[PDB]
Amino acid sequence: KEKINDFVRGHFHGCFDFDLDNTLYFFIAGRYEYKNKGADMFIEALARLNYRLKVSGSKKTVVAFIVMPAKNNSFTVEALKGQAEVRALENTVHEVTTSIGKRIFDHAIRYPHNGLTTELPTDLGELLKSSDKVMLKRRILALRRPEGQLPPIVTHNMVDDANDLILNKIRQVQLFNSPSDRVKMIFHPEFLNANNPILGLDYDEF
Amino acid sequence: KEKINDFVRGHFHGCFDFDLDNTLYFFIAGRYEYKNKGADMFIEALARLNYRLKVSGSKKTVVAFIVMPAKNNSFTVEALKGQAEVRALENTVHEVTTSIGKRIFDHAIRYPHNGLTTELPTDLGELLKSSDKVMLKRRILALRRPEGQLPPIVTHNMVDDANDLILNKIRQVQLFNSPSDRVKMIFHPEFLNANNPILGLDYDEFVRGCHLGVFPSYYEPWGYTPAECTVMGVPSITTNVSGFGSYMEDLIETNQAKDYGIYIVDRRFKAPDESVEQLVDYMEEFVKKTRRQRINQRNRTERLSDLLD
Amino acid sequence: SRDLQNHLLFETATEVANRVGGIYSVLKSKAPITVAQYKDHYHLIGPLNKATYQNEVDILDWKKPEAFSDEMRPVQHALQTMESRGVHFVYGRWLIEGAPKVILFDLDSVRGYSNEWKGDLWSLVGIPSPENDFETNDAILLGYTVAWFLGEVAHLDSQHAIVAHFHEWLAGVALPLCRKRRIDVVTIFTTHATLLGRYLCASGSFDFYNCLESVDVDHEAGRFGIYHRYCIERAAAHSADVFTTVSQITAFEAEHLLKRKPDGILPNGLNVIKFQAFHEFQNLHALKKEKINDFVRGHFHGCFDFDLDNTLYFFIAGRYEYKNKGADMFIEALARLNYRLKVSGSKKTVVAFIVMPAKNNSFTVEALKGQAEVRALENTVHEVTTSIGKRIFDHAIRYPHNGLTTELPTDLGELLKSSDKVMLKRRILALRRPEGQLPPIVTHNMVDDANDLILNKIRQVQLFNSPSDRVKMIFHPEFLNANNPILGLDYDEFVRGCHLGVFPSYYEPWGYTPAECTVMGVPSITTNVSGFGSYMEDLIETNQAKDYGIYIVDRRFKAPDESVEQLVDYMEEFVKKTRRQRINQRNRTERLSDLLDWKRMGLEYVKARQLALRRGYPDQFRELVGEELNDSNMDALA
Ligand SMILES: O=c1ccn([C@@H]2O[C@H](COP(=O)(O)OP(=O)(O)O[C@H]3OC[C@@H](O)[C@H](O)[C@H]3O)[C@@H](O)[C@H]2O)c(=O)[nH]1
Ligand SMILES: O=c1ccn([C@@H]2O[C@H](COP(=O)(O)OP(=O)(O)O[C@H]3OC[C@@H](O)[C@H](O)[C@H]3O)[C@@H](O)[C@H]2O)c(=O)[nH]1
Ligand SMILES: O=c1ccn([C@@H]2O[C@H](COP(=O)(O)OP(=O)(O)O)[C@@H](O)[C@H]2O)c(=O)[nH]1
Ligand SMILES: O=P(O)(O)OC[C@H]1O[C@H](O)[C@H](O)[C@@H](O)[C@@H]1O
């Protein structure tokens, strides 16, 4: 689940307004048979669940995955780029905490000498410097997305987007991952595999 | 030097009141020959250097190492315990920063939603929770040493502590590692080796880490100690009665030799007390150096390498 | 009557709180050394940018008696006199190192007088001024407003000499006004290019450095629709007591196109930030280079058959000006270098970067994918090595018991298990490229790929990153930025990671690029028609210059084919160097950086301001020095 979360943060970069500790992950998977496998019921029912959760004031969130192979030209630029930006934020955070660590350590080992009246740091300015702030802010800016852009409903570039049954149904029921939607749609038109660059999981692990 | 820093933090646990970024590391090394190798002049000059630095209001700290093997019963429980206590604080700090990291990250990734109005956290309490504060406080308490107890002048239990020359000399000059002393003394009565549990360095590594070797020998036909030291780009003090000292005194004009990090104390044509004062003038001169000037000197020292090959 | 040692400085430009071009960087980086000399006697003057001045200017009140000293009172009363007519302005500190005082004039508050001043300017100096040209209109409004102000300061300050320095034709209109009105202020004009220069080199077909001396300036300025602008630049050049350019090469073109031999050179310095330890720049180079390496492994995934420990990084960077920045020579020369390195049987590899912005639709799927696949291998290796460690450790802690005859494991099978292998093999399969596909020559999807000059030239010379090519090409058609997902470096970081800048410019009055590259301790190729190259040419004997990392191509006195060959010679000369030779060369290059610092270059601004005082007040200058010093040049004087 922590690997799915890592994917989900990337996918919702700039539009990340729910708690993953209060998020559930539904999925349908299999061979692309829109009728026989019930992708039509699945998507309809999700749209109806979305309504029910908004009406009922639920604070929970459902990210629903559809994993059915369709004809595609691989991952989108957006997918990869969002995964990279989150990864850059992680590394910049890891740098900053290594520095915070050295400053916490110094305070701790030095107490109670050189005017250190408290056992631990009390003011964040002792630990977080200008330099640290600047680069964390730049990482946040990179995650920002254009005014009014929403998280996509599909991770790949489709060969025939306009005629795809799954995507036509998701458009028809209007599940566009808006902030007020309690149910989110992610179509991943390909079998899962740990070699994937965005959701690096074998099917059984997912 | 950072490895020396790690040891020093342990050795001074609970009495750590100086900046290691403004701390210099002097050392004498060799075999236990109190007179011949000049341990007596070293300890004496350091005691006077301490006085000069307190009088001049110097913000520098010198930590003096003595590395000479004596008969011992291995490391003190205190020396080993202190090291384990610092190591335990480091691991707790690392646990805590991992948590802080997840909190910064969450904030950064979520901004500006869910009422996160600033790009970053502004209040420490968002990042540092009470459970973190508790385990840090326990590690700090464990580093605490009893009221009045000072950092030791020695790292090992000595066989016949009372009659040891180095220790009696340290006691006599009263360099007990007080907070007010700008010179600190650490006697390590064993040869250095990487398998050492408290100072896990080979001798060559430890020498590289220091700032100044101090080898005021009376009888030293050669003196491999300042030569090794010089080959590693570490400035050294020696004497004009040592082979190395006279051999270098010959090769460089004696006042220029300072600029190459070869300090030569006159033990031939001066009374012992004029010599001690000279050794102290050198130590004081070196302490007054900035970092940039230390870096330039070490370069010049290192340039001599070839001449000792 | 008037003091020449204690004197005022008014430095006027379009860009003073206001990022437009490179002049902003010059005046900003120069402020520290200027403020150190003048303190509260110095003022920068410019037009107020109402939209953006809030973020740069510390707005300071000018009415209080604590704003100015007793001797600097006249400037207060002069600003008051401007306020007496309703000329609205902003006094303040420019929020930059040095904290210099600025006077920003709101142009909207004199736009009524447009028609009067345009007419005055027409009959005085002959300068026409179309209404659709919004920038000359503003240049005119600025010039009259500033000459007015300097006229009032001259009236009210009878202690100090006044020096008025102007940068670029846009801030030049005040100069003919100061001359004709005979205002008691000595004037300097610095041009950072010429209008006819830029425009005559725009097509990339005109033989500029040879046909320059035979151009009918009025004719060409009419041909390019810039006659009115040309006259402003020309009037500013002629009216100024001292006339300056930023380089010897630009002084050549200035003399024939502006019809006045400049009185000397004002090359652009930097504010070089030193490191405590001289060698730290070497450390940084290795850290930044490791990030370039990381990018390259991804870029060449599946086709990685060379040693990065024996690879060099060349780059060009700048505005996309194919011909004027010599991206054409660069690519041509590299295709020739590639041939020489194959013939000689060198195992080395050059990876050449082109960093020049072109219209694009961001990174390619491929670029991002290979970076992620390499990253996935890294993580899988890290898991495996963690396992390996558990197995080594157990053996180490357990020896010599339970039949362990050797201190360490000896068979790889003891450490690397079936599941470890399967993982690693799968990561390797993800890095596999399709049969025949070569690493690309560009990292982005281009808006007009088929018609791009850079890509067409790479395709023409056929540098397609095949295994047998010793030179690789990577076009990165966007400015570098640490936020970039594939090469997360800022420009300065990337430059430090590289081995050689290559900037074979044709039109380049200064050459900020090779100067900045020099300051990072990275050697570079420039040209003798670049202002940086012409400056280094005269400062160092050109065979010694190579030992300092400054290679200088002759594009003035050689045919283009001879220039290309020389460019190949230098590139090749550099590849031959060992690591130890590269390190010593960078040390030499870094040592040379002190010369590009404003502490040294700002003396030339002093020499220009001296000459202005010596020329405007010769009788007083003679008697405040030992004797009559010569005034034909800045050099001749000092
Ligand atoms: O921790 C340490 C400290 C020092 N050393 C080594 O100890 C050596 C210095 O030892 P000593 O003090 O015995 O001085 P020296 O060995 O140079 O000569 C002295 O003792 C031996 C005799 O050959 C000489 O006549 C005498 O002057 C150096 O080679 C140094 O590398 C270690 O191996 N580990
Ligand atoms: O990725 C990059 C590449 C380059 N740069 C910056 O862009 C500059 C290079 O572009 P510029 O065109 O501004 O500088 P150039 O040396 O190419 O000068 C050119 O343009 C400005 C004019 O004043 C000069 O006369 C002209 O020759 C460098 O100084 C560098 O700091 C980046 O910030 N990021
Ligand atoms: O990303 C995926 C998704 C599904 N499957 C497998 O595909 C098989 C066949 O799916 P299908 O819907 O065709 O099942 P069937 O119609 O046979 O019930 C299942 O056993 C799944 O384990 C897979 O290997 N990777
Ligand atoms: O990138 P190169 O020219 O091979 O330089 C490589 C060298 O760079 C710096 O000097 C580093 O300090 C050296 O450790 C490194 O070996």
Swiss-Prot record, chain C:
GO terms for molecular function: alpha-1,4-glucan glucosyltransferase (UDP-glucose donor) activity; glycogen binding; identical protein binding. Coiled coil: none annotated. UDP binds at residues 19, 319, 513. GO terms for cellular component: cytoplasm; cytosol; glycogen granule; nucleus. Phosphorylated by the cyclin-CDK PCL10-PHO85. Phosphorylation causes inactivation of enzyme. Keywords: Allosteric enzyme, Cytoplasm, Glycogen biosynthesis, Glycosyltransferase, Phosphoprotein, Transferase. It is found in: Cytoplasm, Cytosol. Alpha-D-glucose 6-phosphate binds at residues 279-280, 282, 285, 289, 499, 582, 586. UDP-alpha-D-glucose binds at residues 192, 198, 319, 508, 510-511. This is Glycogen [starch] synthase isoform 2.
